């Protein structure tokens, strides 16, 4: 696929403290399908707790 449900790349990396967009993309994409990438989730602690 190629679109944002099949073949998606609408993917955000984890910055400093500025990704509540994470659960946002979750809430949208999981109910709608997709190929969502999240980068740099190890330097982040508490959201990843």
């Amino acid at each position: 696929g190629f679109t944002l449900d099949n073949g998606k790349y609408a993917s955000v990396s984890l910055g400093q403290g500025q990704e509540p967009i994470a659960m946002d993309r979750l809430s949208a994409a999981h109910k709608n399908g997709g190929w969502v990438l999240l980068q740099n989730i190890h330097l982040t602690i508490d959201w990843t707790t």
Binding site: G15, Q16, G17, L43
Partner: protein, 144 residues
């Protein structure tokens, strides 16, 4: 490397134990200052780690901005060392850098990559705690 002067006072002490340690430190600082990023001249105590940087800054007319670490450099100290170094064109040399806290260091290190991703395009301003204002370009950081 070659550089001009910036008019700082000296007069109560001179060349403090200038050693090939100290010399090679200067060498690294200067050649890095061709490509200013900051340095890690790791120095223990009794070995001359950071007071040399005060004198070297005075030599280049700079009031050196040291966090002389014994229990210091909390979140706010990393938070404002940017504007602090910028006002003077100061140098951030870290007397026992291994005594700087850590969660501060993670947050301000992400902020650092923002700052220097801005700077090393060779521009006017620098982006820290999401604040981006021009400065006088003499700011370094030295891990001793």
């Amino acid at each position: 490397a070659e550089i001009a002067y910036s008019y700082e006072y000296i007069g109560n002490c001179g060349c403090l134990c200038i050693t090939p340690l100290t010399d090679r430190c200067f060498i690294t600082l200067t050649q890095a200052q061709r490509l200013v990023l900051g340095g890690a001249p790791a120095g223990p105590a009794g070995t001359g780690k950071t007071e040399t940087t005060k004198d070297l800054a005075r030599a280049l007319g700079i009031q050196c901005y040291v966090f002389n670490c014994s229990d210091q450099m909390d979140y706010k100290a990393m938070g404002h060392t940017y504007k602090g170094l910028a006002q003077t064109g100061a140098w951030g040399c870290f007397d026992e850098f291994n005594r700087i806290p850590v969660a501060v260091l993670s947050v301000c290190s992400t902020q650092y990559k923002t700052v220097l991703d801005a700077i090393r395009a060779k521009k006017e301003r620098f982006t820290f705690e999401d604040a981006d204002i021009s400065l006088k370009s003499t700011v370094m950081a030295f891990i001793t």
